[PDB]
Structures are given as C-alpha cells and as structure tokens.
Amino acid sequence: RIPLQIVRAETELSAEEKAFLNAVEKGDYATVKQALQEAEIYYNVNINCMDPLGRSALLIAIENENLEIMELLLNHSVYVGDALLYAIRKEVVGAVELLLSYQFSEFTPDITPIMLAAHTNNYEIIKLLVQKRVTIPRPHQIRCNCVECVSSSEVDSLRHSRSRLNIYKALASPSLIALSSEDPILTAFRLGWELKELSKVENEFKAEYEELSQQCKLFAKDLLDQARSSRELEIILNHRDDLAKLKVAIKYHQKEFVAQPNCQQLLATLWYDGFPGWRRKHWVVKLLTCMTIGFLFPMLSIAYLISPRSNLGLFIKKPFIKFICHTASYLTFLFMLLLASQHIVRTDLHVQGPPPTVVEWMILPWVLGFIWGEIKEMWDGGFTEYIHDWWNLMDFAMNSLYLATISLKIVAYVKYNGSRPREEWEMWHPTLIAEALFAISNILSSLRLISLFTANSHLGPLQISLGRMLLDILKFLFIYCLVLLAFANGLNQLYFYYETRAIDEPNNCKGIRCEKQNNAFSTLFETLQSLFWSVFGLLNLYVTNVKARHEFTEFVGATMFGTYNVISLVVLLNMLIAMMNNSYQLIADHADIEWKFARTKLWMSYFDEGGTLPPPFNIIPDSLIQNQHYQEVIRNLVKRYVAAMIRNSKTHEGLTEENFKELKQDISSFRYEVL
Amino acid sequence: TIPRPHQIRCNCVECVSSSEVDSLRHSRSRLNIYKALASPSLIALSSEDPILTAF
Amino acid sequence: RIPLQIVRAETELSAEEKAFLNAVEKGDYATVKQALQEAEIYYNVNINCMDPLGRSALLIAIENENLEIMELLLNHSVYVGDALLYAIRKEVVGAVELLLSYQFSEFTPDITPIMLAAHTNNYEIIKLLVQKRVTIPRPHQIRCNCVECVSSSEVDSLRHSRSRLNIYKALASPSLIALSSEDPILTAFRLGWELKELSKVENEFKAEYEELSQQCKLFAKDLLDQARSSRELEIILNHRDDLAKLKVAIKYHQKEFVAQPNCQQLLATLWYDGFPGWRRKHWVVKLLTCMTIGFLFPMLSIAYLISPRSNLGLFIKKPFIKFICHTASYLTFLFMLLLASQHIVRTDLHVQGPPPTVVEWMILPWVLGFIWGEIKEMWDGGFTEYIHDWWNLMDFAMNSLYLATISLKIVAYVKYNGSRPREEWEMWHPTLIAEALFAISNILSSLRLISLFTANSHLGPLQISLGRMLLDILKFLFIYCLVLLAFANGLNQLYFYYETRAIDEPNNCKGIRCEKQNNAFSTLFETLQSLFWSVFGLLNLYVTNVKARHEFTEFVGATMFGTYNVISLVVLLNMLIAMMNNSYQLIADHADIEWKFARTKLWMSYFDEGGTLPPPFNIIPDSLIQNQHYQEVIRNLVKRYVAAMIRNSKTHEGLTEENFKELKQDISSFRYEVL
Ligand SMILES: CC(C)CCC[C@@H](C)[C@H]1CC[C@H]2[C@@H]3CC=C4C[C@@H](OC(=O)CCC(=O)O)CC[C@]4(C)[C@H]3CC[C@]12C
Ligand SMILES: CC(C)CCC[C@@H](C)[C@H]1CC[C@H]2[C@@H]3CC=C4C[C@@H](OC(=O)CCC(=O)O)CC[C@]4(C)[C@H]3CC[C@]12C
Ligand SMILES: [Ca+2]
Ligand SMILES: [Ca+2]
Ligand SMILES: [Zn+2]
Ligand SMILES: [Zn+2]
Ligand SMILES: [Zn+2]
Secondary structure, X not given: OEOOOOOOOOOOOOHXXXXXXXXXXXXXXOHHHHHHHHHHHOOOOOOOOOOXXXXXXXXXXXXXXXXXXXXXXXXXXXXXXXXXXXXXXXXXXXXXXXXXXXXXXXXXXXXXXXXXXXXXXXXXXHHHHHOXXXXXXXXXXXXXXXXXXXXXXXXXXXXXXXXXXXXXXXXXXXXXXXXXXXXHHHHHHHHHHHHHHHHXXXXXXXXXXXXXXXXXXXXXXXXXXXXXXXXXXXXXXXXXXXXXXXXXXXXXXXXXXXXXXXXXXXXXXXXXXXXXXXXXXXXXXXXXXXXXXXXXXXXXXXXXXXXXXXXXOOOOOOHHHHHHHHHHHHXXXXXXXXXXXXXXOOOOOOEOXXXXXXXXXXXXXXXXXXXXXXXXXXXXXXXXXXXXXXXXXXXXXXXXXXXXXXXXXXXXXXXXXXXXXXXXXOOOOHHHHHHHHHHHHHHHHHHHHHHHHHHOOOOHHHHHHHHHHHHHHHHHHHHHHHHHHHXXXXXXXXXXXXXXXXXXXXXXXXXXXXXXXXXXXXXXXXXXXXXHHOOOOOOOHHHHOOOOOOHHHHXXXXXXXXHHHHHHHHHHHHHHHHXXXXXXXXXXXXXXXXXXXXXXXXXXXXXXXXXXXXXXXXXXXOOHHHHHXXXXXXXXXXXXXXXHHHHXXXXXXXXXXXXXXXXXXXXXXXXXXXX | OEOOOOOOOOOOHHHHHHHHHOHHXXXXXXXXXXXXXXXXXXXXXXXXXHHHHHO | OOOOOOXXXXXXXXXXXXXXXXXHHHOOOOHHHHHHHHHHHOOOOOOOOOOOOOOOXXXXXXXXXXXXXXXXXXXXXXXXXXXXXHHHHHOOHHHHHHHHOOOOOOOOOOXXXXXXXXXXOOHHHHHHHHOOOOOOOOOOOOOOOOHHHHHHHHHOHHHHHHHHHHHHHHHOOHHHHHHHOOOHHHHHHHHHHXXXXXXXXXXXXXXXXXXXXXXXXXXXXXXHOOOOOHHHHHHHHOOOOOOHHHHHHHHOOOHHHXXXXXXXXXXXXXXXXXXXXXXXXXXXXXXXXXXXXXXXXXXXXXXXXXXXXXXXXXXXXXXXXXXXXXXHHHHHHHHHHHHHOOOOOOOOOXXXXXXXXXXXXXXXXXXXXXXXXXXXXXXXXXXHHHOOOOOHHHHHHHHXXXXXXXXXXXXXXXXXXXXXXHHHOOOOOHHHHHHHHHHHHHHHHHHHHHHHHHHOOOOHHHHHHHHHHHXXXXXXXXXXXXXXXXXXXXXXXXXXXXXXXXXXXXXXOOOOOOOOOOOOOOOHHHHHHHHHHOOOOOOOHHHHOOOOOOHHHHHHHHHHHHHHHHHHHHHHHHHHHHHHHHHHHHHHHHHHHHHHHHHHHHHHOOOOOOOOOOHXXXXXXXXXXXXXXXXXXXXXXXXXXXHHHHHHOOOHHHHHHHHHHHHHHHHHHHHHHHO
C-alpha cells in the first residue's frame, strides 16, 4: 500500500510552446507562420523549444516529410544541429537535399553524415554525399603501440572500441565499396580477411566483426553472379593485379566465391583437357579408360623424358592424366610394400646384418623420389604455406621414419658380421629397431591414401565432415586424460606395496600382456596401460586381488576400479556421442561448399608444369589494355548488381508508405485548389 | 496507487480467509498485481533505482 | 521447333457481352441500367452471359461488394443460382442478407449454405442462417450395413466419402456448437471421441479427422478457461448429466482439459485435505511428516476398524494419508520378502516337504489381501476397464504365481514325508518348482514399485516418456527375431552333424553354460541361446571348431557367425538408437500434459471410500436447480468466449480491406454529391 509518483520529472513547457508544437505536428502553413511572427515580436514562443521526448519542431517536420515547414524554419534561423542525421536515418532524399542546400540526441557524438549513410547502405544518399568531397577516417593496425592509440585506449576504452567498430561498419558497406573503389572484388577480399582477423583480437565484439566479414564475402559472390558471358568470366578470373584472381580468392578463403557454378564449369573445362564430352560417356567406359590409362604409367613418362614435343610425350601434361599417373605410381609403391612382408621374397631370418633384398632395392628409388619431391615443393612455393596443410606433417613423419630405417640398416650392416640366434639378441638391436620403424612407416604410408577421397562426389563430403569433427574429439581427449591420470595415481598409490618379481609368476611372465594377468597396478606405467585397456574390456577382474588376505584393501581397489569404469564408460562416452551429434548437425549444412573448395584446391595443384613426373621418374636428371577491359567489365557488373538490388528493394511497407504520402499530398493539393 | 501483496509464505488471517473463500480470485488478483508491477515503463517512471528494482 | 497453340479453346462472347461485363466490373449504375434495357428490348446482351473464367455479372458484383447492382439485377430476374454460396464464402453479411431477402461451379453439388457457413465458422452468418429454421443431415453409425449405406458405397465411393467428411466438418464447428447445443462441453467430448474413432476406420482420410478431433478438444479447453470464480468452476466440474464431469473427461481422454491450471488447483485442494498450507512448509519438515505418518500405518487402521467415527479413525479417510499408508504397507511386504531369503530365518535345506516358516506365515495374509483386493476392484468398477491399465496384467501374473507356489507347496507337503539329499532329487520336484515360481513372483512384485513414480514432480515425466518409447522397442523386436531365426536355422543346419555326448566332454558338462563351451550349434534351442548370448559378448570364438580337421566347414561357420555379428551389432542397434532419438524428440514436447493426466488418474483412485484399508487389514470382516445453474454459467462462458474470439478476429488484412472499401464508398458519395 504505497502510492506511485514521478521521480525523474521533466520540466514541461508553457501553453504557448505546447500550442506551437501541436500546430507544427498537425501541419498549418499559416498558423505556424503567425506563431513564428509572434515569437519574433513578443517572444511568446521559444524558437528552440523541445518536446519532452526530445523532438523539436524541425524533427517533427522531418518525420512528417513535409518540406515547406522545414524551409520556412530554416529561413527563420532555428537550431538546425543534428538534423541531417535524422534525415539520413529516415532515408528521405528530398529532405537530405534541403538541409544540404543550407543536450539529448539519439546518436553517439562520433557519427558523421557519411558514416551514417554508409551504415544505411542507401546508394542514392551515399552518392549525393560523396559528390561533395567527403572523407572517412581510417584506423591503425590491429596490433599498434603508437602513443595516440595507447592514450586513447587509456582514457576511454568504450569510446575507442565504439569508434573503431563504427568506422569498420561504414567501410564494409557494399554501396560505398561499389561507388568509391576501383577493384571492388579485391577490396571485399582484403576487408573480409581483416575483419575475420580482427574478430579474434576483439573477442568481446566477435559476432559483429563476423557478420561484417560475412557481408563482404556475400557482396563479392553476388557481384560475381552478374556475369553473362564466358569472355567476361575469363576476364574477371584471369585479371592480374594464370588464374591469378582465383588464386587470390583461394588464399583469402573465399569458399562461396570459388564454389559458384560458373567458376566450377570453367575449372572442369580446364581439368578435362583431353576428354571432350567426358560426362557424355557411360560410367563403365569411363572406368575402363581409367584402368587403361593407369596401367600405361611407366610409358607416357619415358616418352615425356625422351621426347617432350612428341605426340605421346604431350599426353602426361594434361591434369587428369597426370593425376591418374601419380595415383597409379603410388598404388604400385603400396603393392611393393605389401610384397615386402611375404614368404615368397623374404627368407633367412637368422642373419644379424642382412644385405638388402630385391624388394628393398626396388623400394629405395620411390623413397628417394618422395624425399626429393617434398624438398623441391617446400623450396618452390613458400615455406610458411608448406605447414598449413596438415598432410605435409604425415609426409614429414613418414620420410623421417624411412630415413631412420635406412640409417639403422646401414649401421647394422657395418657393425655386425655373422649369425646369432634371434632369441639371444639384446633389446635394442639395430635390426629390431629398423624393423619396427619400417612397420610404422608402412602404416603411415598406407593411411596417406585418404587424401584422394576429395576427388569423388560421394566420399569427399564425408571425409570433410569427419576431418571437421576431429577437432572436437581432440577437445574431449583432455578431460579424459585428466580423469585417467587421477585414477592411475590413486590405484598405484594403493597397490604399489604388493609388487612381485617375474621369477615367482608362472611362465616367468609379468604384466597384463600375459595369459594370467598380474601386477596390473604395481607401477605408474603399468597402471596407465591397464586403465587404458579396461576401456575395451580386455582387463580381467581378478587383477584387484592381492596374494595375502587383505579384504579391506581388495574391496577398496575394486571400488576404485568400478568408479573409474562407471565414470569412463557410462558418462564420458555418452557425452561424446551427444556432442558428436550436435557438431554433425551444424556441419551437414555446408558440406557441399567445403567439399568443392577442397576439390578446387586439389585440382589447382596439377595445373602448373612443375613436378610433372611421378616420384619414381622424378629423380633422373600488355597491362593497360587488360586494365581497361577489367574496368569495363566491372562497370557492367556493378551497374547490373545495383539495378537488381534496387528492384529488390521494392517492399510492401515502403510502397504503402509512399502511396499514402502521395495520396495525402494530392488530397491536400485538391483541397487547397478548391479552397 | 497500486496494492502490494503479502509475503510468499504468509499465514495472516486475511490471506487465509481469502484463500479459503475464492482461491481462483485470489490467485488471479496476485498474478495481475505482479504483472502490473513488472512493467518496464512503470518501473522507469516510478522507481529511483530501476536496476536494483528489476534485480 | 514446334509452335504453341490453344487446344481447349473457350467459346468467346460477343463485343456486346464483353462491354456489359466491363461495365459491370467497373461500376456504372446508369450504363448497366441502359445495357439491361437494351438486352430487354433488342436482346443485344445475354442476361445470363458468363465470363470465360466462370464469372457472371452477379458474381463480379458480389466480389465487388456493391449491393445496388446486385439488387437491380435481382429485380431484372437474372440467374441467381449458386450465388449465396459465393456470398457466404466471401463472408459479406450485407450481401448474404440481400440474397436471403429474395454448368461450371467452384462448389461440389452436396454443399448447402448452412454447411458452408459452418465450414467458415462465422458466428454472425451462422446465426442469421439458423434463425430461418435450417437443418443438417446426420450420418449413419461407423460400422453400418443398411442397404442405403451399401448402395451408396457401391455406386459412388468418392461422393459418399466426401459427403460424410463435409457433414462431419460442418458438425465440428465451434460456433455452430455454441449456437445450437445445450451442453457444448459434452457435445465436444463426444464428437472428438467419435472423430478419433472414425479416423482409424477411414485410414485414407486420417489427418482430416485427426484435425477435427483436435479442434473439438481445443474448443472444450478454451471454453473452460473462461471461468472467473471457484463457484463457477465447481458448478462446471460437479455437473451430473462427485466430480462427474471430470470423470467423463477422463473417460474421453481430454488431457488438455484435465491439465488446465484451475482444475489442477481444485484437485490439489481436494488432495491435501488435512494439510492446509502444505506448500508453505519446508521440504525437510514435509519429509519428516511423511516418515512419521508412514510408521504409524498399523495404527490409524485398527483405529478405523474399531471406531470409524472417532477423531483418530477419521484420519485414514484423507487421500494423502491413505496413499502414504498403502505405500508403507507395500514397503513392509517387500521388506519381509527380502527377509525371506536370509540366513537368519531360513535353515535346514535338506527336507523334502518342509512346513511353512514364520516369514512365510507372515507373508501369506498379504497375498490373500492382494488377491481379495484385485477381485473386489475387478467386480466393482467395470470388467472391461480393468484390462485397459497394463499394470493389472502384472498384478494378475504375480498373484497367479503366488497361487501356484502355494498349491505346489501344499501338494509337496501332502505327498512327501521324509528326507533325501538334494543332489539326487528329480528335475521336476515340486519344491524346486515352487522355489522357482516364488523367485519369479518376487522379481515381479519388486518391479511393481514403478507405478508410484507418477506422484513425483521429477520422476513422473521421465517414467511417462520411457513407457511411451516401449512400443517402438516392441516394433524393432520383430525384425530382430526374424533375423535371429534365419541365422539359427542356417547354423544348426551346418553344424548338426557333429554332435557329441556329455560323457566325452570334460566334467561331463554339455552346452555353453560350462567352463569350456561346446555343442553351441548342435540343436536349434542351443543355437538360439548361443546367438542370443553373443549379443553381449559371452560366447567364445572356439565354439566354431569341430573335432575333426574340416577347415572348409569351420571357415563357413566362422563366416556365418561374423556376418550375424556384423548385422546384429553394427546395423540394427544403431538404427534402434537413431529411431529412439527421433521418438524422444517428439515425446519431449507434451511430457507435462501426459504426466498431469496420469497423476490426476492416480489421485482420483483414492477419493472414493471403497478399499480404504491396506491389504493386510482389508481381509478382516434436486436436478432442475442444478440444471438452471449450469445453463446460466454456460451462457456466461459462451458469451465471454464469443466476445474474446471476435476481438481476436481483428486482423490487419481485414481492417485494411474494410478501411479501403469505406474510403471508396465515401469518396464515391462525395463525388456524386458534387456532381
Ligand atoms: C577400400 C579398399 C578397396 C581401398 C583400396 C585402395 C585403393 C585401391 C583405393 C583407395 C582410394 C581410392 C581412390 C579414391 C578416389 C578416387 C577419385 C576418383 O575420381 C573420380 O571419381 C572422378 C569423377 C568424380 O568426380 O566423380 C578416381 C579413383 C580414385 C583416385 C580412387 C582410386 C583407388 C584408390 C586409390
Ligand atoms: C532406488 C531405491 C532406493 C528404491 C527403493 C524403493 C522405495 C524405498 C522407493 C521406490 C519408489 C519410491 C516412491 C516414489 C515416489 C513417491 C511419491 C512421493 O510423493 C511426492 O513426491 C509428492 C510431492 C510432489 O508432488 O512432488 C512420496 C514418496 C514416494 C511414494 C516414494 C516412496 C519410496 C519408494 C517406494
Ligand atoms: Ca606433400
Ligand atoms: Ca490392480
Ligand atoms: Zn596507432
Ligand atoms: Zn498475509
Ligand atoms: Zn446405414
């Protein structure tokens, strides 16, 4: 039971001011005139009177989009400050032209008319403003330590951040870009890249910068979709500041630009150089052509080596043929690797240092070619780009393992000369180490074949999606490792008092890899291995029993093991499944764009003339006119895009408002004529 | 003025009698009073600490 | 290169007819008059001329909602057939009144004006039509063999079905129900039930009948939400054609009606009879009150038996107290069942026919009370309702098992007198069979405790959701069983040649329940058991080996087992998981309504005065004025609902059309006045 009052009271204006505001709002070309005369003579009305909701007479007239009252008030020298911004926001060209013809605010004090027009993206008002030689400030580098930036960040961080965001939002306007830039596509590429990089430095305002970068990418794509001819498309794609613009787009991660249908058709035409009407043929004949071209890989290569200008020697220069030949060569290498571990070719397993066999002699040139190709690619093409592939890491590991295997084999051959039973060799015998490294490198080289899946229309998107989920798998791995370490520490602390020697165990075997598992929690390493193997159910339940009858200790150990099993197998795995599902739901939307970007990147690596020969055979020893053409095509594209966007801007609300205003104007004119 | 309701757990005779005669009317009246009190415009107009009042 | 022509040409009308139609469409009170005069005199115009798009002049005027031309044409005796339907569909009251004042069509020939008005759900037009003593046909029973129905279904099934659907769609109109029914709530209940039952007989038009039933349910609920007082709510809920209307709603499956907040408050007030301000107390004190009331269950019952009118004897008549007492009694029975299988109370396991122990003597009265209560409930309350619970099946199985156990114990006690080692008893000893049946009944009785979860705010919805998924689990069971039978047949056919006797096996054990598993696929029963147990990984891999060296047979058996494992564990289980997820996604939306319906059904079973005592103690031996009140409250509710729906019918499109038409009319009037 407490009354309600007004705490922050507003100082009301007099009846004269209220009547003046009412007349201004209603619209009376004569009553407002006589009110202004009275204000001039007797000062009964304040010319600068303000509505309690901060709405002066000029603002009321602007919101009423009637220009006669505004012109009269301008002639009467009313306070005109901060009215051009209201006109711009209301998007009224006539009023904007009128004010351009010469406390409390709804706009921050850093906003300029040109910036506000750019935020609105109105081409007609932006052009009108830019016609009067306006400028826009440009911000400092993302990581800048200059005194002016440091002082600004030290006095008003909120103001600094808001000003930077406003400037970038103005600069990212498609209409401003089209009006003021000479290379709109390149400008959009660079601006999108800069905004994407800035979003992670200003982590608080991340979504705004993300949306600005998306806007720039959409503008570039939509500008590309306005091409009407193959000649125009080639002029756009081949412009050098052979497909220089496409390479720049790939560098700047313009996936929607690259995956556009007109670009994909050009790329496919370049890809199928020697097979006109490839999509006309049946899948059976295409498959048979693939097999026949694959089997002739040793030829077409010797021909290219002995006669590049010959008809046969020019066949391997086509991208699809080159890809098929490289694939066939890699498959042959893998088949020899398979042949290495067979009974047919490898015998006499009793020699300490064995000379290389025929299969190893055949294998060596492939390894040399792989290493030479990796080094040559890394030298020619950029060192910093070589590491942003995530497959070159596998290549490096595989080649390092092969080099270590060769070195260990040579060392063993030099050091050892004779025979000895394998059962009495030491643990660290060079032959044993070389065999282990060879097996690991075989696994890696066989797993490398995944990267060829992106060339297929059915397996490529699936491979991209799996590669996208791998990161979140890596995210869960951390929590799992922490839980595993905690429980391993506890179990080892409990059980380390009951260690036994291998002598007293059956068969003199110690650990969990024996037929009767024992000493599962005697050391930290063994405890970690046991807790890892219990995830798949390969650890038996009698490993929690000690030889003595310590029932309390055995029960505590069993309860520890059961709690670990519950936490690991009932909770963490199901949470992993749930978040896998959530990730795949979002990933499945953009699978096509990512797959086409990946396939374009894969195709573009076979276009150049470097590294034509497969690894087995690769170790044997005017500008102005182009600028005018680009400018003409850009003019046409910008005109078409602007016209299309203007015709799209026709909306029901705008049309209804325009018709209502026009009908009101005509009715007023007819009433005045009658009167 | 606007009436203000009793504590969430109140045993006063007036609350008990009201809940014993017309529970539907009592609940509807309480909900209407709280819906009126939770108005942003009313808060901004009549409160001196709108943030604390909203909290 | 083939030209395009017109195949189904329309016979065009003459220039006179085209001019007449143009004048009618444009609107000319004098030009149309002189055209009609010319048609009368020289017959230059056809009064019945039709637009090529089937649009006569009267239809054009109706779509123009100008009544002067329609009245003039009616005075001129133009073909007026099938125009009232167009007026009704356009929903123009003035035109409808005008035509009511006295080839090609867009309406099927079975549609009447009243049916069309009911389809539109316009209260103003429905009332206007019903004021003139109109009727609507009513259809025959869902399963009717009368000659007229058989002949109609034998001549035109499409026409018959369309007519039935149209009649039901007209009858299911909320405005028609409110206008013409004396008990709208009961009418909505019955109509929704009938439509729901009809949807599964007309399986082709299932969705239409489902939507009609949903419409009826929504109407009944929305009518209920218009109560403003507890007295009105009690009048509505207690009306008998003690909560008769609520019981009818429960019988007709009106979940949204029952789960409404005003009804739930009344039910909670009835439920907490002896605890005013129950929700005011803390959860700790509420819990402690629950425990104390539970422990005093033997008392409050003897008090009710020896003095029902006493202050102590009237406590058990409250529903919450009765529920707590029954729960405590059941928990005591389960605790005695737990005590049955302990070392403290049961000894001397060597007697063939043993006399009952003290725990069994204590157990027997509970079983007798359970059986008596089941029989009494089944007699008093309806036999056909007793089977639609799906818990009474568990009750019946449990009580049958207890009866069989008692009978077998009595038979064994009568037949056997002496002692014998248990190891030399036969397979079918009555004591062994009775023990097995007792254990199974113990499992069932312990599992019965699930039904008490619906009383809790956290476990109830979860239990309802699981019970909803059980049906789809049952759906997958069929496919799994078929696959299992196929593979069992194949494996038994392959392996039945290598059966071995138990004598030659170690420990003289035969089957897969031995320590060394053998004869896994020797018989069909054993093959089925092995293939069942392989789902959980409890079958070892050496069971596919025969004693002889038949490598082809062993490999074929291993491949069969591997194919079965892949199909069962990699495909079917993952599909089950996927469809579980899909089912839960839809189930999670309406969990609250279903849970509240279930809790209301559970609460209502403790309101009546029959079966007050728990099973241990239950074996010891005017209408007119109510009608006027209901009619008044129904009048108020219908008026409020109609007013609310009318105020909700205000839409932007309708308001804009009305304002445009009114402005056009006023402009025309002003122009005529000026002229
Ligand atoms: C699962 C087992 C059988 C793998 C055996 C290894 C190789 C025989 C496979 C592994 C990946 C395969 C490659 C995966 C995808 C492609 C792309 C494919 O190109 C297309 O499909 C082009 C037409 C299109 O775009 O659809 C040509 C075959 C090739 C190189 C495949 C050749 C055969 C490869 C090397
Ligand atoms: C998992 C183990 C511990 C089960 C042991 C068996 C019994 C001790 C449990 C099983 C189900 C329980 C019942 C489940 C739900 C309820 C409803 C509950 O009622 C409310 O919560 C009312 C208030 C509300 O609506 O939230 C009162 C206890 C009771 C009967 C529980 C009493 C104790 C029961 C019989
Ligand atoms: Ca590489
Ligand atoms: Ca029952
Ligand atoms: Zn700076
Ligand atoms: Zn109070
Ligand atoms: Zn009939």
